[PDB]
Amino acid sequence: SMAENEIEEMLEHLRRIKSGGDLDWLDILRIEELEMVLRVFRTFTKYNDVLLPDSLVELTKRAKLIGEILHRLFGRIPHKCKTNLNLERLESHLLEFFQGNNNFDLSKYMDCLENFLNDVLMMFLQKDRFFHSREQLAKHRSIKELKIVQKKIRFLKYIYATEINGYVDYEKQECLENRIQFMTNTVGQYCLAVLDYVTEGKLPPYLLSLIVLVELEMKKIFHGEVK
């Protein structure tokens, strides 16, 4: 819960800087982009304990990615206020946090999926001021799929609510847990790619298939009751 404190206090500082003080519209637009970045990374730090890759050599390049992202991001803040704020301290804290690596918290995984879908949607439906060739409807198919995936997650969180909250009474369903963990990791790296993309990224996910497979496994395992 360390990086969450620093993120929330940087958000409060940015709120104070916005609430009162002469700053050009453009400067507070950069500030808004920065606090969006910070909310994304806040979700990441909140649910990083469940983002478990299999080979930490993948963690090597994930840390590389997060590092160069965080460094490219701390570039367009006004030199006016970037001196006044401890951004480099926050960056160091976050880099240190993101190299930290039989009960399954299946409420945390659904919450991570919900939060990450909300974040990907929020970052998509922000930047589409930068409009491009009218084949951009591809994006709108993507959005559509996401809006279904998102909704489907809510569906899965309603029907199996008592089974989710209280999954510790049930035993290991390696199929279900492996599918959920794979989708969680996929959504994490997807949110990271979207954050890089919406922010002049140096460098398709097939999430509906995964959420459908999770839904079917859940129906199989949770409707095999006496109810």
Side-chain angles (χ1 to χ4, degrees), residues 13-99:
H13 278 199
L14 297 163
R15 200 183 326 182
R16 175 84 272 174
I17 293 171
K18 274 185 304 185
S19 177
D22 185 279
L23 281 171
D24 301 64
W25 188 243
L26 283 301
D27 292 356
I28 85 161
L29 291 195
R30 319 273 161 78
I31 297 308
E32 281 194 356
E33 188 178 71
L34 169 62
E35 54 193 357
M36 179 260 288
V37 164
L38 292 177
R39 293 193 295 262
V40 177
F41 280 124
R42 177 182 68 185
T43 300
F44 261 109
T45 72
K46 187 179 194 304
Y47 295 109
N48 185 27
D49 60 316
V50 311
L51 295 200
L52 312 172
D54 279 311
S55 298
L56 62 87
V57 174
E58 210 166 12
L59 189 152
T60 299
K61 293 179 179 179
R62 177 212 179 182
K64 165 188 63 183
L65 267 294
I66 298 169
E68 44 203 358
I69 292 183
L70 285 168
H71 185 72
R72 210 198 68 253
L73 292 173
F74 287 34
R76 81 185 66 172
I77 296 93
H79 186 34
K80 188 185 289 185
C81 53
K82 81 165 70 176
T83 48
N84 299 113
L85 297 177
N86 313 118
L87 295 89
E88 292 152 306
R89 202 172 92 201
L90 185 48
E91 153 187 329
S92 173
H93 269 163
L94 287 175
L95 305 182
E96 172 185 351
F97 191 68
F98 284 154
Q99 285 80 244

XYZ file of all heavy atoms in Angstrom, residues 13-99:
734
model
N -2.076 16.856 -4.793
C -1.273 18.015 -5.158
C -1.717 18.592 -6.493
O -1.815 19.813 -6.648
C 0.203 17.635 -5.210
C 0.871 17.620 -3.872
N 2.239 17.691 -3.725
C 0.362 17.537 -2.620
C 2.544 17.656 -2.441
N 1.423 17.562 -1.749
N -1.978 17.729 -7.476
C -2.459 18.214 -8.762
C -3.830 18.859 -8.632
O -4.121 19.841 -9.322
C -2.495 17.069 -9.767
C -1.137 16.454 -10.100
C -1.317 15.098 -10.742
C -0.336 17.368 -11.001
N -4.677 18.331 -7.749
C -5.975 18.947 -7.509
C -5.817 20.332 -6.902
O -6.521 21.273 -7.285
C -6.809 18.051 -6.598
C -8.298 18.307 -6.654
C -9.023 17.425 -5.660
N -8.360 16.133 -5.520
C -8.796 15.149 -4.742
N -9.905 15.304 -4.033
N -8.123 14.010 -4.675
N -4.898 20.474 -5.949
C -4.629 21.783 -5.370
C -4.097 22.747 -6.422
O -4.492 23.917 -6.460
C -3.640 21.647 -4.213
C -3.193 22.963 -3.606
C -4.183 23.463 -2.569
N -5.242 24.269 -3.169
C -6.290 24.739 -2.505
N -6.426 24.483 -1.212
N -7.205 25.462 -3.135
N -3.204 22.270 -7.288
C -2.658 23.113 -8.346
C -3.750 23.542 -9.316
O -3.722 24.661 -9.839
C -1.511 22.382 -9.064
C -0.327 22.216 -8.118
C -1.084 23.119 -10.312
C 0.753 21.329 -8.654
N -4.729 22.677 -9.568
C -5.838 23.071 -10.427
C -6.787 24.009 -9.695
O -7.156 25.067 -10.217
C -6.576 21.833 -10.933
C -5.968 21.222 -12.191
C -6.808 20.072 -12.721
C -7.004 19.013 -11.661
N -7.709 17.826 -12.196
N -7.181 23.649 -8.476
C -8.097 24.478 -7.704
C -7.387 25.730 -7.219
O -6.820 25.745 -6.123
C -8.666 23.698 -6.518
O -9.505 24.521 -5.725
N -7.408 26.781 -8.027
C -6.764 28.021 -7.656
C -5.389 28.170 -8.266
O -4.549 27.275 -8.149
N -5.146 29.301 -8.918
C -3.875 29.533 -9.569
C -4.027 29.731 -11.060
O -4.792 29.015 -11.710
N -3.318 30.710 -11.611
C -3.388 30.953 -13.042
C -2.508 29.960 -13.786
O -1.288 29.935 -13.612
C -2.964 32.382 -13.370
C -3.130 32.713 -14.841
O -2.244 32.345 -15.641
O -4.153 33.333 -15.199
N -3.141 29.142 -14.615
C -2.440 28.219 -15.489
C -3.197 28.166 -16.801
O -4.426 28.070 -16.797
C -2.343 26.825 -14.870
C -1.271 26.616 -13.809
C -1.454 25.267 -13.162
C 0.098 26.711 -14.447
N -2.465 28.254 -17.907
C -3.077 28.188 -19.224
C -3.885 26.908 -19.352
O -3.597 25.919 -18.671
C -2.012 28.261 -20.317
C -1.184 29.524 -20.238
O -0.470 29.697 -19.231
O -1.243 30.339 -21.181
N -4.911 26.926 -20.202
C -5.707 25.724 -20.411
C -4.823 24.552 -20.806
O -5.017 23.430 -20.328
C -6.772 25.987 -21.475
C -7.762 24.888 -21.625
C -7.967 24.118 -22.726
C -8.686 24.431 -20.637
N -8.962 23.207 -22.484
C -9.420 23.379 -21.207
C -8.962 24.807 -19.324
C -10.411 22.700 -20.510
C -9.952 24.137 -18.640
C -10.660 23.094 -19.229
N -3.827 24.805 -21.657
C -2.964 23.739 -22.149
C -2.213 23.064 -21.013
O -2.077 21.832 -20.996
C -1.970 24.298 -23.165
C -2.424 24.609 -24.593
C -2.964 23.369 -25.278
C -3.436 25.738 -24.629
N -1.720 23.852 -20.062
C -0.987 23.285 -18.942
C -1.868 22.349 -18.131
O -1.452 21.240 -17.786
C -0.427 24.401 -18.066
C 0.657 25.192 -18.763
O 1.018 24.825 -19.898
O 1.146 26.180 -18.180
N -3.106 22.755 -17.844
C -3.960 21.860 -17.073
C -4.477 20.707 -17.912
O -4.899 19.695 -17.352
C -5.155 22.578 -16.427
C -6.313 22.695 -17.399
C -4.749 23.958 -15.966
C -7.594 22.947 -16.684
N -4.424 20.808 -19.240
C -4.687 19.633 -20.062
C -3.579 18.604 -19.899
O -3.850 17.404 -19.747
C -4.833 20.033 -21.529
C -6.069 20.843 -21.914
C -6.244 20.836 -23.415
C -7.308 20.308 -21.223
N -2.325 19.053 -19.936
C -1.219 18.156 -19.611
C -1.382 17.578 -18.210
O -1.086 16.401 -17.971
C 0.116 18.885 -19.729
C 0.240 19.807 -20.919
C 0.733 19.093 -22.162
N 0.420 19.854 -23.370
C 1.098 20.921 -23.781
N 2.137 21.359 -23.087
N 0.738 21.551 -24.890
N -1.862 18.394 -17.271
C -2.076 17.926 -15.905
C -3.147 16.845 -15.867
O -3.026 15.851 -15.141
C -2.436 19.112 -14.991
C -1.276 20.100 -14.917
C -2.805 18.633 -13.603
C 0.041 19.469 -14.554
N -4.218 17.028 -16.640
C -5.272 16.025 -16.711
C -4.746 14.718 -17.279
O -5.054 13.637 -16.764
C -6.429 16.539 -17.564
C -7.361 17.506 -16.870
C -8.650 17.698 -17.637
O -8.770 17.126 -18.739
O -9.544 18.412 -17.140
N -3.967 14.796 -18.357
C -3.370 13.586 -18.911
C -2.500 12.888 -17.879
O -2.549 11.660 -17.734
C -2.553 13.921 -20.155
C -2.057 12.699 -20.897
C -1.280 13.045 -22.147
O -0.147 13.545 -22.027
O -1.805 12.820 -23.255
N -1.705 13.661 -17.142
C -0.840 13.068 -16.132
C -1.645 12.381 -15.039
O -1.299 11.277 -14.611
C 0.072 14.132 -15.535
C 0.844 13.689 -14.294
C 1.769 12.541 -14.627
C 1.621 14.846 -13.722
N -2.719 13.009 -14.568
C -3.483 12.363 -13.509
C -4.279 11.172 -14.024
O -4.554 10.250 -13.253
C -4.396 13.359 -12.798
C -5.317 14.147 -13.678
C -5.943 15.313 -12.947
O -5.680 15.460 -11.737
O -6.698 16.078 -13.579
N -4.614 11.142 -15.313
C -5.166 9.922 -15.894
C -4.142 8.796 -15.860
O -4.452 7.663 -15.468
C -5.620 10.185 -17.326
C -6.181 8.971 -18.027
S -5.015 8.166 -19.132
C -4.943 9.340 -20.471
N -2.914 9.100 -16.284
C -1.808 8.148 -16.182
C -1.682 7.634 -14.754
O -1.497 6.436 -14.505
C -0.500 8.804 -16.651
C 0.677 7.994 -16.203
C -0.495 8.962 -18.148
N -1.786 8.548 -13.793
C -1.610 8.174 -12.398
C -2.750 7.296 -11.906
O -2.532 6.383 -11.112
C -1.475 9.423 -11.534
C -0.191 10.203 -11.792
C -0.163 11.462 -10.966
C 1.007 9.341 -11.490
N -3.974 7.549 -12.366
C -5.078 6.672 -11.990
C -4.896 5.271 -12.559
O -5.178 4.271 -11.877
C -6.403 7.269 -12.455
C -6.782 8.542 -11.732
C -8.224 8.922 -11.990
N -8.447 9.258 -13.389
C -8.477 10.498 -13.862
N -8.305 11.522 -13.044
N -8.682 10.713 -15.151
N -4.414 5.175 -13.797
C -4.128 3.867 -14.381
C -3.102 3.125 -13.535
O -3.315 1.978 -13.114
C -3.643 4.021 -15.830
C -3.276 2.677 -16.408
C -4.703 4.679 -16.658
N -1.970 3.772 -13.278
C -0.937 3.129 -12.480
C -1.420 2.842 -11.069
O -0.947 1.899 -10.434
C 0.317 3.992 -12.466
C 1.135 3.853 -13.701
C 1.458 4.951 -14.464
C 1.546 2.610 -14.122
C 2.195 4.809 -15.614
C 2.285 2.465 -15.265
C 2.611 3.566 -16.012
N -2.375 3.622 -10.571
C -2.944 3.345 -9.263
C -3.679 2.023 -9.266
O -3.532 1.215 -8.344
C -3.888 4.470 -8.855
C -4.591 4.227 -7.541
C -5.545 5.347 -7.225
N -6.668 5.376 -8.151
C -7.595 6.324 -8.159
N -7.530 7.321 -7.293
N -8.588 6.276 -9.033
N -4.490 1.793 -10.297
C -5.137 0.492 -10.435
C -4.105 -0.624 -10.521
O -4.254 -1.673 -9.878
C -6.031 0.478 -11.667
O -7.039 1.483 -11.533
C -6.693 -0.866 -11.809
N -3.048 -0.406 -11.305
C -1.991 -1.407 -11.414
C -1.419 -1.760 -10.046
O -1.344 -2.935 -9.676
C -0.886 -0.913 -12.343
C -0.984 -1.457 -13.727
C -1.362 -0.650 -14.780
C -0.694 -2.778 -13.978
C -1.450 -1.154 -16.052
C -0.784 -3.283 -15.249
C -1.162 -2.471 -16.287
N -1.010 -0.751 -9.278
C -0.450 -1.017 -7.956
C -1.468 -1.659 -7.027
O -1.096 -2.460 -6.166
C 0.079 0.263 -7.314
O -1.018 1.092 -6.921
C 0.985 1.015 -8.262
N -2.745 -1.320 -7.174
C -3.758 -1.937 -6.331
C -3.889 -3.425 -6.612
O -4.081 -4.212 -5.680
C -5.100 -1.240 -6.535
C -6.186 -1.682 -5.580
C -7.476 -0.929 -5.846
C -8.466 -1.101 -4.712
N -8.756 -2.530 -4.431
N -3.777 -3.834 -7.880
C -3.975 -5.233 -8.238
C -2.714 -5.884 -8.793
O -2.811 -6.812 -9.598
C -5.119 -5.376 -9.243
C -6.460 -4.987 -8.682
C -7.090 -3.825 -9.087
C -7.093 -5.780 -7.743
C -8.311 -3.464 -8.573
C -8.316 -5.426 -7.223
C -8.921 -4.267 -7.641
O -10.141 -3.909 -7.124
N -1.532 -5.431 -8.378
C -0.303 -6.035 -8.877
C -0.023 -7.391 -8.246
O 0.643 -8.224 -8.868
C 0.882 -5.104 -8.639
C 2.166 -5.628 -9.245
O 2.148 -6.377 -10.217
N 3.292 -5.232 -8.672
N -0.514 -7.637 -7.032
C -0.238 -8.908 -6.376
C -0.900 -10.081 -7.079
O -0.573 -11.231 -6.777
C -0.690 -8.863 -4.918
C -2.168 -8.593 -4.777
O -2.678 -7.704 -5.486
O -2.822 -9.272 -3.961
N -1.828 -9.822 -8.002
C -2.465 -10.883 -8.768
C -2.008 -10.908 -10.214
O -2.428 -11.792 -10.968
C -4.000 -10.772 -8.698
C -4.450 -10.610 -7.261
C -4.480 -9.622 -9.542
N -1.164 -9.969 -10.628
C -0.570 -10.000 -11.961
C 0.681 -10.856 -11.876
O 1.794 -10.355 -11.725
C -0.253 -8.598 -12.461
C -1.409 -7.631 -12.706
C -0.960 -6.519 -13.631
C -2.596 -8.351 -13.283
N 0.497 -12.167 -11.978
C 1.586 -13.121 -11.793
C 1.989 -13.731 -13.124
O 1.313 -14.648 -13.613
C 1.166 -14.217 -10.812
C 0.520 -13.733 -9.518
C -0.023 -14.904 -8.725
C 1.523 -12.944 -8.697
N 3.063 -13.267 -13.753
C 3.593 -13.982 -14.914
C 4.219 -15.302 -14.495
O 4.530 -15.532 -13.325
C 4.645 -13.020 -15.478
C 5.045 -12.192 -14.317
C 3.812 -12.030 -13.482
N 4.404 -16.180 -15.477
C 4.948 -17.509 -15.233
C 6.467 -17.534 -15.198
O 7.051 -18.081 -14.259
C 4.445 -18.482 -16.300
C 3.048 -18.988 -16.009
O 2.801 -19.429 -14.867
O 2.196 -18.936 -16.918
N 7.122 -16.956 -16.198
C 8.575 -16.882 -16.257
C 8.988 -15.447 -15.972
O 8.648 -14.541 -16.737
C 9.089 -17.329 -17.625
O 8.761 -18.683 -17.878
N 9.720 -15.239 -14.877
C 10.090 -13.874 -14.523
C 11.041 -13.240 -15.527
O 11.333 -12.048 -15.403
C 10.690 -13.825 -13.116
C 11.983 -14.562 -12.764
C 13.212 -13.719 -13.075
C 11.959 -14.949 -11.294
N 11.538 -13.990 -16.515
C 12.159 -13.367 -17.675
C 11.151 -12.537 -18.457
O 11.529 -11.537 -19.082
C 12.831 -14.442 -18.555
C 13.369 -13.843 -19.844
C 13.950 -15.119 -17.781
N 9.867 -12.898 -18.411
C 8.826 -11.996 -18.885
C 8.695 -10.786 -17.968
O 8.430 -9.674 -18.436
C 7.495 -12.742 -18.986
C 6.552 -12.227 -20.056
C 5.418 -13.197 -20.341
O 5.233 -14.148 -19.554
O 4.715 -13.010 -21.357
N 8.889 -10.987 -16.660
C 8.891 -9.864 -15.729
C 10.032 -8.904 -16.029
O 9.902 -7.701 -15.793
C 8.980 -10.375 -14.289
C 8.795 -9.422 -13.104
C 8.255 -10.188 -11.909
C 10.095 -8.737 -12.729
N 11.150 -9.414 -16.546
C 12.271 -8.561 -16.916
C 11.847 -7.525 -17.947
O 12.007 -6.315 -17.746
C 13.423 -9.408 -17.463
O 13.869 -10.321 -16.453
C 14.579 -8.523 -17.894
N 11.287 -7.991 -19.061
C 10.829 -7.074 -20.088
C 9.608 -6.271 -19.664
O 9.453 -5.139 -20.121
C 10.541 -7.826 -21.397
C 11.741 -8.434 -22.108
C 11.326 -9.169 -23.372
C 12.527 -9.754 -24.092
N 12.122 -10.496 -25.319
N 8.754 -6.805 -18.787
C 7.649 -6.003 -18.269
C 8.169 -4.825 -17.460
O 7.670 -3.702 -17.580
C 6.715 -6.857 -17.416
C 5.583 -6.060 -16.786
C 5.180 -6.643 -15.448
N 4.108 -5.886 -14.812
C 3.604 -6.177 -13.619
N 4.075 -7.204 -12.931
N 2.631 -5.440 -13.112
N 9.167 -5.070 -16.611
C 9.788 -3.988 -15.862
C 10.464 -3.002 -16.797
O 10.382 -1.787 -16.591
C 10.792 -4.556 -14.863
N 11.140 -3.506 -17.831
C 11.725 -2.628 -18.841
C 10.667 -1.715 -19.449
O 10.852 -0.493 -19.534
C 12.403 -3.468 -19.925
C 12.734 -2.710 -21.198
C 13.225 -3.651 -22.284
C 12.145 -4.642 -22.680
N 12.629 -5.619 -23.692
N 9.554 -2.306 -19.885
C 8.450 -1.546 -20.457
C 7.946 -0.492 -19.486
O 7.834 0.684 -19.841
C 7.313 -2.485 -20.862
C 7.259 -3.011 -22.299
C 6.993 -1.865 -23.259
C 8.528 -3.742 -22.697
N 7.618 -0.898 -18.260
C 7.056 0.041 -17.293
C 8.037 1.166 -17.013
O 7.637 2.326 -16.859
C 6.654 -0.693 -15.999
C 5.581 -1.737 -16.291
C 6.122 0.288 -14.983
C 5.323 -2.680 -15.148
N 9.328 0.859 -16.987
C 10.335 1.868 -16.759
C 10.394 2.897 -17.863
O 10.278 4.100 -17.602
N 10.575 2.443 -19.104
C 10.645 3.411 -20.193
C 9.325 4.142 -20.386
O 9.334 5.303 -20.802
C 11.089 2.746 -21.498
C 10.429 1.430 -21.813
C 11.264 0.589 -22.757
O 12.341 1.060 -23.178
O 10.848 -0.542 -23.073
N 8.199 3.521 -20.036
C 6.920 4.222 -20.096
C 6.891 5.345 -19.072
O 6.681 6.510 -19.416
C 5.750 3.247 -19.892
C 5.633 2.295 -21.077
C 4.456 4.010 -19.733
C 4.459 1.360 -20.978
N 7.105 5.007 -17.798
C 7.103 6.014 -16.741
C 8.091 7.133 -17.024
O 7.858 8.287 -16.648
C 7.417 5.355 -15.400
C 6.287 4.543 -14.783
C 6.799 3.724 -13.628
C 5.231 5.505 -14.297
N 9.198 6.817 -17.690
C 10.168 7.859 -17.984
C 9.737 8.729 -19.156
O 9.917 9.949 -19.111
C 11.535 7.244 -18.254
C 12.615 8.258 -18.436
N 13.113 9.005 -17.390
C 13.291 8.658 -19.538
C 14.049 9.818 -17.840
N 14.177 9.628 -19.142
N 9.174 8.132 -20.209
C 8.640 8.930 -21.305
C 7.466 9.783 -20.845
O 7.212 10.851 -21.413
C 8.220 8.018 -22.456
C 8.340 8.645 -23.828
C 7.528 7.883 -24.851
N 6.099 8.026 -24.611
C 5.331 7.059 -24.126
N 5.857 5.877 -23.844
N 4.039 7.271 -23.932
N 6.749 9.333 -19.815
C 5.556 10.039 -19.367
C 5.904 11.291 -18.587
O 5.141 12.263 -18.605
C 4.695 9.122 -18.506
C 4.037 7.957 -19.232
C 3.374 7.043 -18.236
C 3.037 8.471 -20.240
N 7.040 11.288 -17.899
C 7.411 12.403 -17.034
C 8.255 13.395 -17.836
O 9.346 13.807 -17.442
C 8.153 11.891 -15.807
C 7.272 11.197 -14.796
C 6.171 10.455 -15.184
C 7.567 11.269 -13.451
C 5.378 9.819 -14.246
C 6.775 10.634 -12.514
C 5.683 9.909 -12.913
N 7.726 13.765 -18.999
C 8.451 14.633 -19.902
C 7.715 15.879 -20.342
O 8.345 16.897 -20.645
N 6.385 15.820 -20.395
C 5.588 16.933 -20.895
C 4.870 17.684 -19.784
O 4.073 18.585 -20.071
C 4.593 16.445 -21.950
C 3.323 15.818 -21.409
C 2.469 15.272 -22.549
N 3.116 14.152 -23.230
C 2.536 13.398 -24.157
N 1.285 13.635 -24.523
N 3.208 12.404 -24.716
N 5.130 17.333 -18.532
C 4.708 18.186 -17.417
C 5.422 19.526 -17.535
O 6.591 19.559 -17.953
C 5.020 17.504 -16.079
C 4.219 16.213 -15.926
C 4.719 18.418 -14.910
C 4.943 14.980 -16.400
N 4.768 20.646 -17.241
C 5.457 21.936 -17.324
C 6.682 21.971 -16.424
O 6.622 21.606 -15.248
C 4.392 22.933 -16.863
C 3.108 22.276 -17.173
C 3.327 20.808 -16.982
N 7.806 22.414 -16.993
C 9.003 22.656 -16.196
C 8.738 23.633 -15.063
O 9.508 23.678 -14.099
C 10.129 23.177 -17.090
C 11.444 23.313 -16.390
N 11.848 22.455 -15.391
C 12.448 24.208 -16.547
C 13.044 22.814 -14.961
N 13.431 23.875 -15.646
N 7.664 24.416 -15.168
C 7.247 25.295 -14.085
C 6.992 24.505 -12.806
O 7.644 24.724 -11.779
C 5.991 26.058 -14.514
C 5.554 27.160 -13.569
C 4.235 27.765 -14.028
C 4.407 28.590 -15.293
N 3.149 29.285 -15.678
N 6.047 23.567 -12.859
C 5.602 22.845 -11.678
C 6.277 21.495 -11.487
O 6.215 20.949 -10.380
C 4.079 22.644 -11.726
S 3.473 21.873 -13.243
N 6.918 20.940 -12.518
C 7.603 19.665 -12.338
C 8.738 19.788 -11.337
O 9.103 18.804 -10.685
C 8.128 19.139 -13.674
C 9.433 19.760 -14.131
C 10.076 18.960 -15.251
C 9.288 19.077 -16.540
N 9.947 18.371 -17.672
N 9.309 20.984 -11.201
C 10.293 21.222 -10.154
C 9.633 21.174 -8.783
O 10.181 20.617 -7.828
C 10.976 22.571 -10.378
O 9.982 23.575 -10.619
C 11.913 22.498 -11.571
N 8.437 21.753 -8.679
C 7.727 21.837 -7.411
C 7.221 20.489 -6.921
O 6.897 20.366 -5.735
C 6.547 22.798 -7.540
C 6.978 24.202 -7.889
O 6.687 24.701 -8.974
N 7.676 24.850 -6.969
N 7.139 19.486 -7.787
C 6.563 18.202 -7.428
C 7.603 17.098 -7.535
O 8.459 17.102 -8.424
C 5.365 17.871 -8.314
C 4.187 18.833 -8.185
C 3.093 18.447 -9.152
C 3.670 18.875 -6.757
N 7.510 16.144 -6.614
C 8.481 15.065 -6.518
C 8.142 13.935 -7.473
O 7.855 12.817 -7.038
C 8.537 14.542 -5.085
C 8.615 15.654 -4.064
O 7.724 15.812 -3.231
N 9.684 16.436 -4.124
N 8.173 14.211 -8.776
C 7.836 13.177 -9.745
C 8.894 12.084 -9.778
O 8.564 10.899 -9.842
C 7.642 13.775 -11.136
C 6.486 14.742 -11.385
C 6.897 16.163 -11.090
C 5.997 14.605 -12.813
N 10.172 12.463 -9.754
C 11.235 11.465 -9.780
C 11.174 10.533 -8.578
O 11.468 9.339 -8.710
C 12.592 12.160 -9.852
C 12.834 12.878 -11.165
C 13.777 14.052 -11.029
O 13.520 14.926 -10.177
O 14.776 14.100 -11.776
N 10.773 11.046 -7.419
C 10.564 10.204 -6.250
C 9.453 9.190 -6.488
O 9.606 8.006 -6.166
C 10.236 11.080 -5.045
C 10.493 10.438 -3.711
C 10.332 11.456 -2.616
N 8.982 11.476 -2.072
C 8.469 12.503 -1.408
N 9.194 13.593 -1.219
N 7.233 12.444 -0.939
N 8.333 9.644 -7.049
C 7.232 8.741 -7.357
C 7.654 7.690 -8.368
O 7.278 6.519 -8.255
C 6.044 9.540 -7.884
C 4.761 8.766 -8.143
C 4.452 7.888 -6.959
C 3.629 9.725 -8.400
N 8.438 8.095 -9.364
C 8.929 7.168 -10.373
C 9.801 6.095 -9.741
O 9.650 4.902 -10.029
C 9.700 7.939 -11.443
C 10.759 7.136 -12.166
C 11.606 7.997 -13.080
O 11.083 9.001 -13.601
O 12.794 7.673 -13.275
N 10.731 6.507 -8.880
C 11.572 5.541 -8.183
C 10.732 4.585 -7.351
O 10.953 3.369 -7.366
C 12.584 6.273 -7.304
O 13.305 5.360 -6.499
N 9.758 5.123 -6.617
C 8.892 4.283 -5.797
C 8.155 3.258 -6.646
O 8.056 2.082 -6.278
C 7.902 5.153 -5.027
C 8.384 5.566 -3.676
N 7.823 6.607 -2.969
C 9.370 5.070 -2.893
C 8.447 6.739 -1.814
N 9.390 5.818 -1.743
N 7.642 3.686 -7.799
C 6.864 2.783 -8.642
C 7.742 1.706 -9.265
O 7.355 0.530 -9.308
C 6.136 3.578 -9.722
C 4.948 4.414 -9.250
C 4.383 5.243 -10.385
C 3.878 3.523 -8.662
N 8.918 2.086 -9.767
C 9.842 1.090 -10.298
C 10.216 0.074 -9.232
O 10.246 -1.132 -9.493
C 11.092 1.762 -10.864
C 10.888 2.836 -11.929
C 12.217 3.375 -12.418
C 10.094 2.267 -13.080
N 10.493 0.541 -8.012
C 10.814 -0.386 -6.934
C 9.640 -1.296 -6.609
O 9.836 -2.471 -6.283
C 11.242 0.387 -5.688
C 11.412 -0.477 -4.449
C 11.710 0.334 -3.212
O 11.951 1.550 -3.346
O 11.702 -0.242 -2.106
N 8.418 -0.777 -6.692
C 7.255 -1.599 -6.392
C 7.017 -2.664 -7.448
O 6.553 -3.760 -7.119
C 6.010 -0.729 -6.263
C 4.822 -1.452 -5.708
C 4.814 -1.884 -4.398
C 3.709 -1.689 -6.487
C 3.726 -2.541 -3.877
C 2.615 -2.346 -5.968
C 2.625 -2.772 -4.661
N 7.320 -2.366 -8.711
C 6.963 -3.264 -9.802
C 8.041 -4.295 -10.113
O 8.085 -4.817 -11.232
C 6.611 -2.458 -11.052
C 5.256 -1.831 -10.989
C 4.970 -0.688 -11.702
C 4.269 -2.383 -10.198
C 3.726 -0.115 -11.629
C 3.028 -1.812 -10.122
C 2.754 -0.679 -10.837
N 8.905 -4.614 -9.154
C 9.808 -5.753 -9.279
C 9.766 -6.595 -8.013
O 10.802 -7.017 -7.491
C 11.242 -5.317 -9.581
C 11.481 -4.841 -11.004
C 11.023 -3.421 -11.239
O 10.117 -3.169 -12.027
N 11.677 -2.478 -10.578
